[PDB]
Chains A and B, each alone.
Chain A
């Protein structure tokens, strides 16, 4: 069926440029106009640009007019978005989308969305995480259930993976979504509930992995 694959996203410092591409297959790409639409947690869904099937007419959102340039290569079946003078608020997931087929006098929007590519505009440098133990004690025990965890602090960029006992412990694990701090570094927590009668005897180790920095940390969590 129809398939759209975005590529080109990554980490870019503010003020620099970045070029996104969208490879289309499963349909005659040269016969359809295309949209670029971005999604951010702060603004939700936000239309960015539209291009005609032949590139004759292009339109842009007001917040990006003059900085972004949408183009296409119908011989390569590729849609392009050149982004210049990036600001912090442009960090979002960018989707390409295909205009649906309709009648000659109708208004048009998109019916098939691409997979999406993440763009993070930040001046933070690549940095491995600091792993701190969330130690269980009497203050984290209610009956026969205790809670312990690992705090993964001050890393950039996203994402990081957390496992417990090399994947052997999955029941009751809650890894929270990362939060962006005032310093531009991300931080998150991962917690697990265990039988209180197992504390002190069963070994629990959290395995944090961060591919952008090739960081692998096995942190042992001991009670207080």
Chain B
């Protein structure tokens, strides 16, 4: 009929927490173009034993 078309707005502001805990298959499968392009200061500084 003519119910309220807006928020409560005193509705639940927290987690469900029974919401979906899995990984959505239809997520973003591409690389984020504006991701971290710098070198990682905390990375492997040693020498790979399996290197050529």
Report whether B52 and A59 are in contact in the complex, using a CB–CB cutoff of 8 Å: no
Contact partners of A107 in chain B: CB under 8 A: 48, 50-51
* Residue B47 lies at the interface, judged by CB distance under 8 Å to chain A: yes
Report whether B47 and A108 are in contact in the complex, using a CB–CB cutoff of 8 Å: no
CB distance from B50 to the nearest CB of A (A): 4
Interface residues on B, range: under 10
* Residue B5 lies at the interface, judged by CB distance under 8 Å to chain A: no
Q: Which of B47, B50, B51, B52 has the most CB of A within 10 A?
A: B52
Report whether A106 and B49 are in contact in the complex, using a CB–CB cutoff of 8 Å: no
| A-B pairs with beta carbons under 8 Å apart, 15 shown | A50-B49, A57-B47, A59-B49, A102-B52, A103-B52, A104-B52, A105-B52, A106-B52, A107-B48, A107-B50, A107-B51, A108-B50, A108-B51, A108-B52, A109-B50
B50 to A, closest residue via Cβ: A107
A103 to B, closest residue via Cβ: B52
CB distance from B45 to the nearest CB of A (A): 16
CB distance from A99 to the nearest CB of B (A): 9
A105 to B52, CA, bound (A): 7
A223 to B2, CA, bound (A): 109
Q: Which 9 A-B pairs have the closest CB atoms?
A: A107-B50, A59-B49, A108-B50, A104-B52, A108-B52, A102-B52, A106-B52, A57-B47, A50-B49
Over the window 103-119 of chain A, the binary record of Cβ atoms lying under 8 Å from chain B Cβ atoms (1 yes, 0 no) is 11111110000000000
A50 to B50, CA, bound (A): 10
A129 to B26, CA, bound (A): 73
Contact partners of A109 in chain B: CB under 8 A: 50
A102 to B, closest residue via Cβ: B52
Contact partners of B50 in chain A: CB under 8 A: 107-109
